[PDB]
Every structure is written in structure tokens, then in C-alpha cells.
Amino acid sequence: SMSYTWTGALITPCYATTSRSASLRQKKVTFDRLQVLDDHYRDVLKEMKAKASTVKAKLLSVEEACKLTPPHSARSKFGYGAKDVRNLSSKAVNHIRSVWKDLLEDTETPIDTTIMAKNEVFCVQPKPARLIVFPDLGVRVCEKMALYDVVSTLPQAVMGSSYGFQYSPGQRVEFLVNAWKAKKCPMGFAYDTRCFDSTVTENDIRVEESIYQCCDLAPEARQAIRSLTERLYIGGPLTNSKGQNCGYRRCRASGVLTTSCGNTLTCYLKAAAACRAAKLQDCTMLVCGDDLVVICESAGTQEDEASLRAFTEAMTRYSAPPGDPPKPEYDLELITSCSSNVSVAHDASGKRVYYLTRDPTTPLARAAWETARHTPVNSWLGNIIMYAPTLWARMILMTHFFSILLAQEQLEKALDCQIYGACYSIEPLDLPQIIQRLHGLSAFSLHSYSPGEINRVASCLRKLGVPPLRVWRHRARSVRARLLSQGGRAATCGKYLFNWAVRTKLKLTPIPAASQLDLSSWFVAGYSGGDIYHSLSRARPRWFM
Ligand SMILES: O=C(O)/C=C/c1ccc(NC(=O)C2(NC(=O)c3ccc4c(C5CCCCC5)c5n(c4c3)CC(=O)Nc3ccccc3-5)CCCC2)cc1
Ligand SMILES: CNC(=O)c1c(-c2ccc(F)cc2)oc2ccc(-c3cc(C(=O)NC4(c5ncccn5)CC4)ccc3C)c(F)c12
């Protein structure tokens, strides 16, 4: 069937890719899907289901679900919105309860979804706007009641170490490095699917439900999953921001709770089956939704090229064709997944340290847009957290925004940021502890960066007309000195975040308050969607902090 059917009703909104480039994206994401399954697919599916069987999932309370809603979450087309939900207002709560009852009692009627354009700031290179399909706020809260515990527990149970969203940046790197080292002679590749959400057939979505149905579920939770699959997840009518009917969807909705989970499960299912079809030897897989990386045992350049075509043919048969055809790589540092690559530096004692990086052009262009126009959910803070070990995040991002926060006297003001579609509320003052927990103390004392990484950062600054690295070193020294002079977490920010800027470096000891921090949710909800709000809370602060 067609992934989408359009009535021609324009996708109405509320360089930066606007609502006029949304028509180009529509042509790409619209096509009929061909899917042919085989024994490999059925075997992996059965193996997956067997692991799912071990799971027991709890049914969340109205109250529990509400508290997981981001405060910037799209207001209900029923006269309430996010704040009302988060504060458990009689209007919001009573509507959620009705939605839930309707899900328990109505099993066929399609649930309406709103189609919109995501306005992402990219660089002016001399790309069509990404689409966002999501149900009403009330439905989104019910989704959480029924499947939050499933999506939190199930994926790790089924895929183990292959589940991509269970890792802190440091952990992911450690997994990757260990996997590459484990192989006698390793080969690795990244498989990018062309329009993954669109390639997701209605059968894929029912196969996904068959996995959820292996949990020990409450009868209400079971029916909710059943109704949500038929009425919402397999498809339904599309409605623009104005309320006019846009068309119909018969593929994955980006704005649903089961998007990263389902996409992960599906991608994994298809890929693992394709690994068998291509007879790839001793595969280690890492799956982050539509994004996948395979670290297997090399069998020679020509055979590796051959294996990979077989892999692609199988994936294509499973209705998961590639965007770009995969290239076999023989250096871990040469694989690019989630716009990222593994790089290496030295800690304060000269020991090797691997870390994830990326081309800084987009992060910097977006941060530049964000400094100009006030944004509710910023990328710069997410990039600071995600790329804390990187040369560019440390010298340009940390320096620029700490000087700004210093001026505006807003270091203590919690901000909302997105880290690959996930929403987090962070006080910039908590960055050292956050960084220490996600990357380790070495993030604060990395040096001896590769020439390649230094040159990419340098070139990129010239390209964007950003002052050079020597300017940033100078500016960071003022910021450091100012933050130090303020004590507490501010001085910690100066000491730890800006040690790179000082002539003769300080010995850095573990931040004691970093252990108090509870980061549970970050791991158990790392998904590139879900309408999940991860905040920051610390179990019992010691008085002297
Ligand atoms: O060779 C030497 O010895 C010295 C050279 C030198 C060159 C330029 C300066 N620039 C400045 O002082 C000013 N801007 C900046 O000091 C500046 C800071 C951050 C900038 C950023 C981003 C960096 C990441 C966080 C957000 C801000 C961009 N641009 C920046 C400019 C240049 C700009 O204007 N816009 C963009 C556009 C796209 C991408 C980046 C930028 C302020 C007054 C005049 C312009 C200073 C010294
Ligand atoms: C198969 N692709 C991957 O696994 C990823 C690769 C990759 C490149 C080369 C290569 F050779 C192999 C692999 O690079 C990435 C960069 C980034 C991400 C990534 C990281 C986080 C994330 O860390 N989010 C936080 C967090 N999460 C959990 C716990 C705590 N904190 C900071 C908030 C969340 C989502 C994503 C998409 C990724 F998956 C990947």
C-alpha cells in the first residue's frame, strides 16, 4: 500500500527549512511498499519473541503518565495543554480517562493525527523539511500508560547489548571499541535506510505488536496495545495545524511513543535476518532506531563487498532499501553513524581515550541561530552534553554560552534541550557532574587531538566566519576567572569545563556531587521521540554541596 495519500491540503505551520520545502519531502516519503519475508526473518522473529516472553510490564497511572509529559508538548485540540496535564487539571485528567475508556472499548476507529513540518536550522550550502505526525495530547498520555514500561524494559530484553539507546556516550564508545578488538580481523559498516518510517509496512507494525504481546501485561494494557495498533500505529487520517484533512498514513508516525522502540525492534529484526542471508561472520550489531552499525569478522575486501550487496538485497526484500549503499570499513574511526565518528585523544596522564565527534558545521550554525532567536528547546546545550569531550564543544560552544549566561546572570536557570529527539531540562551549573557521569573525568583534560579533527574544526570556523581557536582560548580565560570567583557549581564549571584554557593545568579530582545525580531515565528512555520529558534529580544532597 501507499505510505501516504494526500488530499493536497497544504501542511500549514504554527537558513532554516520552512513550510514551503515540505512539498518536496512529501514526494520522497510517498510510495507503495513491496515486502517479501523468508525463513531467516521468521527465525530471528521467533528468537526475539522468546526473549520478549521474559518481560513483565506495569500499567502506569494517569498521574504517572502526566508527569512524563514535556511542558512544551503540543496542546490538546480539547482546550488543555502540557502545563494543565503536568499539574493534573480536572479538564486534562477527565479527558485522558475518557480517551483510555474509548481505547478499551472501541477497537477499529482510526485515531486522528496532526501532520506538521519540523523547522530545523541547517547550513547555507550553495534539504526538504522533516515531517512530524502525532496524535492528540490525551492519546499521547494514554500511550504512556499502556506502553511506557514496555518501551523501557522490552528492547534491552530482546536485543541485549545491540539496543542502542541504553548507552551513555562513554558506554557506547566502550562497547564499540571492545567489539572491534574482539574480532581477529574486523570489518564494519553503517546501513542507512531510505525513508525508514515510510518503508515500515502495516505488517511490520503488527509484527512489532506480536513482540509487545509476549510481555506479562495487564488486561487493560493488552487491549490498549491492541486498539492503539489498529486505530493509531498501522495508520490513520492526517490533519494539518489548521484542522483540515491532509490525507492518510499507512506507515510509521514519527510522533508516537513506540517510534524509536518499534523502529529499533524492526530495524534489528530485518538486519539480523539480513546478516544470516549475507552469511556475515561473527556480527556485533548496534541499533538506534533506523540507524544501524555492524562490526563483523572480515573475509577479504572483495568477499566483504560481495557480502554487503547480499545484506542490502535482503534488507531491500524486507522493505528496508538503503539511502546510500554501505561501504565496508577497516578502521573503527572511519564508520559514520548518527552523523558521528569515533576519534581518539589523551587524558592528563597520556592514556588513550576514545570519544564520539562529528563535523561541527550544523551544531555551530544551529547554535548561531539559537543565540539570535529565542528557542524553547535548544540544540547547543544538547551538543555540549553529547560532545563534551570534543575540541569544538569545549572551545567554542562552552566558551560562547558560558560568557552569555554569565552576562544574563542565568547560570542557575534550567533550560530545555533535545539530544537526538529526546527532551531534557538542565541547569547549566550541573554540566560538570553530567559530563563526568556520561564521559568520565578525562573529558575535562583531553588533549593531543588528531590532526584530522583539529583541521576539520579549524576549516569549519573559517567557513562560518567564527573567530579562530586562539580567540576562544583568550575568551575562556575570562569566563573561567569569572566563574571561579563565584564559588559553588559556578566555580566547578570554571575549574572543570575550562581547564584546557589555563597555561599550567590543575589536577582534577572526581566531583563528589556527581554520584548523587540520578540519571536512570536517560538510559531507560534515550529514544529519538516518544514525547518523554527527562528532568534532573539528585538522591539526598550532602549539606557541604
Ligand atoms: O585572527 C585574530 O587574531 C582574530 C580574529 C577575530 C575574528 C572575528 C572576531 N569576531 C568577533 O569578535 C565578533 N563575533 C564573534 O566573536 C563570534 C562569536 C561566535 C560566532 C558564531 C557561533 C559559534 C557557535 C556558538 C554560536 C555562535 C558564529 N559567528 C560568530 C562570531 C559568525 C557569525 O556571525 N555567525 C555564525 C553563523 C554560523 C555559524 C557560526 C557563526 C563580535 C564582534 C565582531 C564579530 C574576533 C576576532
Ligand atoms: C548505530 N549508531 C550509534 O550507536 C551511534 C554512533 C556511531 C558512530 C560511528 C560508529 F562507528 C558506530 C556508531 O554515533 C552516535 C552518536 C550519537 C548517538 C546517540 C547518543 C545518545 C546519547 O548519548 N544521549 C544521551 C544519553 N543517552 C543515554 C544515557 C545517558 N545519556 C546524552 C543524552 C542518544 C541517541 C543517539 C542517536 C548514537 F546512537 C550514535
Query: Looking at the structure, do residues 354 and 302 belong to the same domain, yes or no?
Result: no
Backbone angles phi, psi at 293, to 5 degrees: -135, 135
Distance from Cα 2 to the centre of ligand 2, integer Å: 32
Q: What is the torsional sign of CA 344, 349, 350, 351?
A: negative
Residue type at position 33: R
Is 43 annotated as belonging to a binding site?
no
Query: Looking at the structure, do residues 317 and 377 belong to the same domain, yes or no?
Result: no
CB 308 within 8 A of CB 294: no
Alpha-helix residue ranges (DSSP H) falling in 36-136? 39-52, 62-66, 83-86, 90-105
Separation CA 112–CA 328 (nearest Å): 43
Q: Is 337 in the pocket of ligand 2 (CB under 6 A)?
A: yes
Half-sphere exposure of 95 (CA within 13 A, CB side): 22
Grid coordinates representing 84 are 494543565
Query: Looking at the structure, do residues 391 and 491 belong to the same domain, yes or no?
Result: yes
Q: What share of the chain is helix, strand, coil (3-state, %, to 5)?
A: 50, 15, 35
Domain that holds residue 102: 1-339
Q: Is 96 in the pocket of ligand 2 (CB under 6 A)?
A: no
Which among 538, 528, 533, 534 has a CA at the least distance from the CA of 252?
528
Which among 421, 427, 374 has a CA at the least distance from the CA of 402?
427
Instruction: Tell me, in Å, the resolution of the deposited structure.
Output: 3.0
Query: Looking at the structure, do residues 36 and 128 belong to the same domain, yes or no?
Result: yes
Distance from Cα 405 to the centre of ligand 2, integer Å: 27
Number of folded domains in the chain?
2
Neighbours of 16 (CB within 10 A): 12
Query: Looking at the structure, do residues 250 and 272 belong to the same domain, yes or no?
Result: yes
Picking from 321, 339, 357, the residue at the C-terminal end of a domain is 339
Distance from Cα 435 to the centre of ligand 2, integer Å: 15
CA 202 distance to own-chain centroid: 24
User: Diameter of the chain by CA atoms?
Assistant: 69
Query: Looking at the structure, do residues 374 and 247 belong to the same domain, yes or no?
Result: no
Picking from 339, 368, 388, the residue at the C-terminal end of a domain is 339
Separation CA 476–CA 214 (nearest Å): 54
Query: Looking at the structure, do residues 310 and 230 belong to the same domain, yes or no?
Result: yes
- Residue whose C-alpha cell is 506479562: 216
Query: Looking at the structure, do residues 170 and 33 belong to the same domain, yes or no?
Result: yes
User: DSSP of 299-315, one letter per residue?
Assistant: --HHHHHHHHHHHHHHH
* DSSP bridge pairs for 134: 114
Query: Looking at the structure, do residues 27 and 117 belong to the same domain, yes or no?
Result: yes
Residue type at position 491: A
Query: Looking at the structure, do residues 270 and 397 belong to the same domain, yes or no?
Result: no
CB 176 within 8 A of CB 183: no
Separation CA 325–CA 41 (nearest Å): 21
Query: Looking at the structure, do residues 333 and 379 belong to the same domain, yes or no?
Result: no
Q: Is 193 in the pocket of ligand 2 (CB under 6 A)?
A: no
Query: Looking at the structure, do residues 20 and 57 belong to the same domain, yes or no?
Result: yes
Beta-carbon contacts of residue 160 (< 8 Å; ≥ 6 apart): none
Ligand sitting nearest the alpha carbon of 363:
1
Picking from 339, 364, 382, the residue at the C-terminal end of a domain is 339
